[PDB]
């Protein structure tokens, strides 16, 4: 609580040893990330099935901290770790209609939930994550 | 914090002294309340401006635990406390079109944010709150 209370007072909330922040504006993937960096954090990194479920239940399209390595169709989290367990929604990732879809969102759609690759210059609400305890 | 882990494994999350649960289905105000009771909780009770802001930032229409006393246009939280500080959206509460709007939702609309009285038999996602720390 000494650690957490200053963050709660700014609208962060706590799930399994991280704090999370949901933005009140949409932004490009890069400027979303810049906000989280400025807060001493980063875009959210999904490390378990439970954290994915927690993410999905906000019923909100959210940028998360996963981005393609160049155009290689391989993926790295913002902390540098490679993608291992994934929650792509059906049919994704797909560089839809031949567009460069290098940044990852969590989608909120009827009959389609999970991650989607999207153009990084499109805008979404975004979720920051700060690990508090190891 | 160890006692939060079973709740976190079910998708609850921690803000200030409470755990919160956002439903994955819509329901009537009364059946929403029944779900929260059977988890040892109740519908959410808004006790401060910070908690209202926390609620508003989910950008979700949610039943919360405020309900009219009969048809008297006075209000009581599900824990029995009378309404004191309030966050009605502009023009609310209003018994819209002469309907009995006895139950309270947090609305997520353009140029209209805050609470709204609504027919209790209508359906919304709902938020449970459980006080964990004294
Ligand atoms: O608008 C961009 C998106 O459009 C559609 O939802 C496609 O399913 C998805 O793959 C694409 O990235
Ligand atoms: O449809 C129910 C609601 O409709 C409109 O939003 C009115 O502004 C609100 O007062 C009423 O409760
Ligand atoms: Ca994480
Ligand atoms: Ca895509
Ligand atoms: Ca409360
Ligand atoms: Ca109303």
Author numbering:
A (entry chain A), B (entry chain E): 47 to 180
Question: Can you list sentences taken from the study reporting this PDB entry?
Answer:
Mincle recognizes its ligands via a calcium-dependent sugar-binding site, containing a conserved EPN (Glu-Pro-Asn) motif, and a hydrophobic groove on the carbohydrate recognition domain (CRD), which are in combination the major characteristics of Mincle. In Takifugu rubripes, one of the first vertebrates whose whole genome was completely sequenced, a protein sequence bearing the EPN motif and a hydrophobic groove was found (XP_029706534.1). Altogether, trMincle shares similar characteristics with mammalian Mincle in its amino acid sequence and its FcRγ-dependent cell surface expression.
Indeed, the crystal structure of the trMincle CRD-glucose complex was determined at 1.8 Å resolution. As suggested by the glycerol complex, one glucose molecule interacted with the calcium ion as well as the surrounding side chains. Thus, the sugar-binding mode of trMincle was similar to the other CLRs bearing EPN motifs. Indeed, computational superposition of the boMincle-trehalose complex onto the trMincle-glucose complex demonstrated that trehalose causes a heavy steric clash with trMincle, suggesting that trehalose disaccharide cannot bind to trMincle due to the narrow pocket. While mammalian Mincle recognizes both exogenous diglycosylated lipids and endogenous monoglycosylated lipids, our results imply that trMincle may function as a receptor that selectively binds ligands such as monosaccharide-bearing glycolipids. This makes it difficult to recognize well-known mammalian Mincle ligands such as mycobacterial glycolipid TDM. Although trMincle may not have the ability to recognize typical mycobacterial glycolipids like mammals, it may detect fatal infection through the alteration of endogenous metabolites, such as hexosylceramides.
